[PDB]
């Protein structure tokens, strides 16, 4: 409402590991919460060059940046200034599994994001460790309430170099840090795109566009 302004800043840090390889990434960005658009620059600070496909990280790098119509309750904009956190599992069809958490606070007009990301069991000759992902397809997140918190599922797909898709199931729990009104069942369509990158993805610009709907 009054704390959500049309243009807001983003600071984040992610620490994590993939198949035991640790790394850390920092980012700064800008977003438009009511238009559902955001953009961010990300720099690898430790563990570079990353030995795995960057695309498994990008949806971990905040549903306040989503366009919500009048007739759908917006769990995320209500939760500020105190904010919310999420917990997420990402189960890839070849057995790679990633867990992640994000804790989101608001300092003035700047969202502060603290991310932990941990992936295991990616096969050495699979598309993640061989880096042959191209992009995520448009992703439809389905959100529902259970036990007083907000959950969501998605059946997402990375298109691969040489063709074919690489499927991943997402399971997220969102936890507001104060009592807010709970929404009914609805969807959010997500388009995420790596806009720019250097040699080894040590510098990446990332863009997201997202809108909610229920009919």
């Amino acid at each position: 409402m009054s704390v959500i302004k049309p243009d807001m800043k983003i600071k984040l840090r992610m620490e994590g590991a993939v198949n035991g390889h640790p790394f850390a990434i920092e980012g700064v960005g800008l977003g438009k919460p009511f238009e559902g658009k955001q953009s961010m620059d990300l720099k690898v600070k430790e563990g570079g060059p990353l030995p795995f496909a960057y695309d498994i990280l990008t949806m971990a790098f905040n549903r306040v940046f989503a366009k919500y119509p009048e007739n759908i309750v917006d769990y995320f904009k209500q939760s500020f200034p105190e904010g919310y956190s999420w917990e997420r599992s990402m189960i890839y069809e070849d057995g790679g599994i990633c867990n992640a958490t994000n804790d989101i606070t608001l300092d003035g007009d700047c969202y502060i994001c603290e991310i932990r990301f941990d992936g295991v069991n990616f096969p050495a000759n699979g598309p993640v460790m061989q880096k042959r992902t191209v992009k995520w397809e448009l992703s439809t997140e389905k959100l529902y309430v259970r036990d007083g918190v907000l959950k969501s599922d998605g059946n997402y797909a990375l298109s691969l170099e040489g063709g074919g898709h690489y499927r991943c199931d997402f399971k997220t729990t969102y936890k507001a840090k104060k009592v807010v009104q709970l929404p009914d069942y609805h969807s959010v369509d997500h388009h995420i795109e790596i806009i720019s990158h250097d040699k080894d993805y040590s510098n990446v610009n990332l863009h997201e566009h997202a809108e909610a709907h229920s009919e």
Side-chain angles (χ1 to χ4, degrees):
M1 294 195 65
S2 196
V3 283
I4 317 290
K5 300 145 150 181
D7 299 270
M8 302 193 68
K9 327 204 86 163
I10 302 148
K11 282 181 56 171
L12 65 79
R13 176 173 169 98
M14 167 196 288
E15 306 184 357
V18 173
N19 289 10
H21 177 93
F23 66 98
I25 295 169
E26 273 162 23
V28 298
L30 289 158
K32 289 177 161 290
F34 303 107
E35 291 178 57
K37 293 189 220 299
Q38 62 173 312
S39 172
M40 63 176 64
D41 298 310
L42 305 149
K43 308 189 78 209
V44 173
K45 300 303 243 272
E46 304 167 40
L50 298 178
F52 55 84
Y54 205 92
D55 289 311
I56 66 167
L57 302 181
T58 53
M59 281 141 157
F61 293 126
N62 181 2
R63 207 69 57 254
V64 84
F65 295 109
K67 187 205 240 301
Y68 266 84
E70 289 198 77
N71 60 328
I72 305 183
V73 162
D74 188 339
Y75 185 84
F76 302 96
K77 292 187 179 70
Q78 282 180 90
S79 75
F80 288 89
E82 294 91 341
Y84 70 101
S85 62
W86 55 251
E87 300 159 30
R88 186 178 293 159
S89 281
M90 297 152 281
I91 303 182
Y92 288 90
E93 63 177 309
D94 64 350
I97 290 184
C98 297
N99 282 349
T101 65
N102 191 359
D103 188 43
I104 298 157
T105 57
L106 191 266
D107 190 15
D109 63 341
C110 184
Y111 296 102
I112 308 292
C113 301
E114 199 172 288
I115 308 166
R116 178 76 208 182
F117 185 100
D118 288 278
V120 300
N121 283 332
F122 285 104
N125 56 13
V128 168
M129 305 306 302
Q130 300 300 157
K131 289 157 151 157
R132 40 191 172 87
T133 66
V134 175
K135 71 176 193 184
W136 289 100
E137 304 283 351
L138 186 125
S139 305
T140 297
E141 179 183 13
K142 300 288 183 161
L143 299 92
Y144 66 101
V145 170
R146 176 170 295 186
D147 295 336
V149 300
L150 187 55
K151 301 216 169 172
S152 78
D153 298 280
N155 53 332
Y156 305 154
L158 281 156
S159 69
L160 300 174
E161 205 181 89
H165 285 90
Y166 178 48
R167 279 269 294 105
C168 179
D169 294 324
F170 274 44
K171 295 198 180 57
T172 307
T173 304
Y174 301 99
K175 296 179 176 175
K177 291 160 174 176
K178 66 172 175 184
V179 175
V180 295
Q181 184 170 11
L182 297 174
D184 295 297
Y185 189 96
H186 66 282
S187 312
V188 174
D189 276 6
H190 303 259
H191 170 77
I192 185 154
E193 188 185 350
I194 293 182
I195 296 311
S196 70
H197 71 85
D198 61 357
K199 162 100 192 135
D200 40 15
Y201 289 75
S202 282
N203 293 270
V204 169
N205 180 277
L206 187 63
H207 174 250
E208 199 211 340
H209 177 32
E211 318 195 351
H213 51 95
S214 54
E215 305 95 279

